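Worked example (supplementary).
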Amino acid sequence: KIPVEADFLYAYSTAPGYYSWRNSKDGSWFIQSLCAMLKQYADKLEFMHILTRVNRKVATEFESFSFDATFHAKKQIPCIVSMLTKELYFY
Amino acid sequence: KIPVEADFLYAYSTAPGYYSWRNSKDGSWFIQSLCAMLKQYADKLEFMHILTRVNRKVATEFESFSFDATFHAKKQIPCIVSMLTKELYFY
Amino acid sequence: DNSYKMDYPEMGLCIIINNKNFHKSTGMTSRSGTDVDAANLRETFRNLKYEVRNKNDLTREEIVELMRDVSKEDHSKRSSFVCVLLSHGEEGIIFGTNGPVDLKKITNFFRGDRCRSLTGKPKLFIIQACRGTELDCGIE
Amino acid sequence: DNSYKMDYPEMGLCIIINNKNFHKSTGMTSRSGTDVDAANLRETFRNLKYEVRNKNDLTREEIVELMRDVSKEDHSKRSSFVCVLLSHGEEGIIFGTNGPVDLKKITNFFRGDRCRSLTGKPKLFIIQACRGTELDCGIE
Ligand SMILES: *[C@@](=O)([C]S[C]C1=C(F)[C]=[C][C]=C1Cl)[C]([C]C([O])=O)[N]C(=O)[C]([N]C(=O)[C]C1=[C]C(/[C]=[C]/C(=O)O[C])=[C][C]=C1O[C][C])[C]([C])[C]
Ligand SMILES: *[C@@](=O)([C]S[C]C1=C(F)[C]=[C][C]=C1Cl)[C]([C]C([O])=O)[N]C(=O)[C]([N]C(=O)[C]C1=[C]C(/[C]=[C]/C(=O)O[C])=[C][C]=C1O[C][C])[C]([C])[C]
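After joint prediction of all chains, the assembly is encoded as:
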C-alpha cells in the first residue's frame, strides 16, 4: 500500500511563474539541452543527476537576444519536481 | 551571469494540495525519516539520492491511525523541487 | 531495492503532444521551433526503447481523451511512462489548439489508484511551457 | 565542476523556525510533536557543521524580518544555506503564530540578485507543512 500521488516526476521547462524560452531554428532551450544530455549520460548517470546538468546547461549557456527592450537578455532556469521513491537508470 | 531563481532547492513535507502528517510522540513523519537518512548517508550519497530514499521511507513505512473515519488510514508522499545546477555532497 | 525495476520486456511508451498552431480565438501565437523539438525528441526516446506516438495540435477536449485512452490500457508488461507536452501555457494550465486546459485532470488518470498497471512504475512527465510572464534578468 | 563547492571555512547557517502555539485568533491547533522535531533537527545539522539558530513561535511579521535580517549578512565565507520551517500551512502559504504569510516574500531576499554572497551557493529550504486538505487513501 502506497501514496497514490507518488512515483510521479515532473520536469518543468522553467521556474514557476516564469516564461519558457524557444529558438526558432533549434527550438526550445530546455528540450534541446535535455535530449543532448540523455545523448551522453543515458547510461552513465541516474536521471536527477542528468536533469541537474540539464539545469546548468540551460542556466549557464543560454541567454536571450532580441530587439525588444523587454524580451531581450533574459535567462531561464528549469524546475525538477520529484516524488519518485527510488532511483532511475534507463538500462 | 545566471538565473536569479536558480540554485534554490525546496523539500516539501508532502505533495502539493495535500496534508502533512505528524506523530505526537516522535513528531513529523517527514522530519524524523529525513534526519535519520542524513544520519546514515550524509557522506555516502549525494542529496537528491538521500531525499529520494526519504521519499520511500515515508511513502512505504508510514500509515496514519485514528478513531476518526476521515483522519484514519491516510498516507503521505513528499515533494522534492530542485533548481540546483550542480550536485551536493556535505563533506 | 534502491533503484527502480526497468527490466520489463517493454521499456514503456513515450507519447509526445506536439502542439503548435493555435486557434485564432485562443489568440496564441504559432510556436516556431516546436517542430525541431518533437523530432530531436522522437529520435531520443526511440534510442532508449519507447513506443513513441506523436500527436499534433490537439484541442483541449482531445488531450484529455487521449489521456483516458492512455490510462486505460495494459501497461502491465511496460516498465514506465513518459508524456512530453510542448505548447503554450500558464501556471498549472497547458494549452489546447482551441482552449486552455487544467493540468490536474490530465495527470490524474495515471494516479496510483486510477492507473493500476503503471502503479509502482515512474510516471515521467516533461512539460515544455509558460508558467507565467516573468523574466530572469540574471545576476553575475 | 559538476558538484557544488563545499570547502569554504563555514559550512553555512541553519536557521530553524519552530512554530507551535498559534494565536487563538488564527484558530490554528497547537502542534504537538513540533518540539521533538526541532531537537532531532538542531542535533542533525549540528553534526554537519551549521550555525543553527532556533527561533520559536514567530508571528508572520517576524519571520519576514528575521529573513531580511538573514539575507542582509555576509555569507561570504559561508558555503551554503538551510531554512527549516515547521508550522501549519496552506498551499504557498505558511503560518505565523498570529497570521498566515506568503512564502514568496520569504524566500525572495536570498534570490540571486538580492542575496549576492549566497549567489551561486545552494539555498536549501525545508518546509514542514499543510499544502492543503487532501488525504492519500493509498493503493496496493
Ligand atoms: C509561452 O507559451 C508563452 S505563454 C503567453 C501567455 C498568454 F498568451 C496568455 C496567458 C498566459 C501566458 Cl503565460 C512560450 C513558450 C513556447 O514554447 O511556446 N514562450 C515564448 O514563446 C517566449 N518567446 C519566444 O520563445 C520567442 C523569442 C525568442 C528570443 C530568443 C531566444 C534565444 O534563445 O536567443 C539566443 C527572443 C525573443 C522572443 O520573443 C519574445 C516575444 C515568450 C517570451 C513569449
Ligand atoms: C497542518 O498544519 C494542518 S493545516 C490545516 C488548515 C487550516 F486550519 C486552515 C486552512 C488551511 C489548512 Cl491546510 C498539520 C501539520 C503540522 O505539522 O502541523 N497537519 C496536521 O496536524 C494533521 N494532523 C496530525 O498530524 C494529527 C493526527 C495524527 C494521526 C496519526 C499519525 C500517525 O502517524 O500514526 C501512526 C492521526 C490523526 C491526527 O489528527 C488529524 C485531525 C492534519 C490531518 C490535520
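Two points are worth noting when inspecting this output. Chain D touches chain B through 47 residues (CB under 8 Å). The domain at 1-140 of chain D is CATH 3.40.50.1460 (Rossmann fold).
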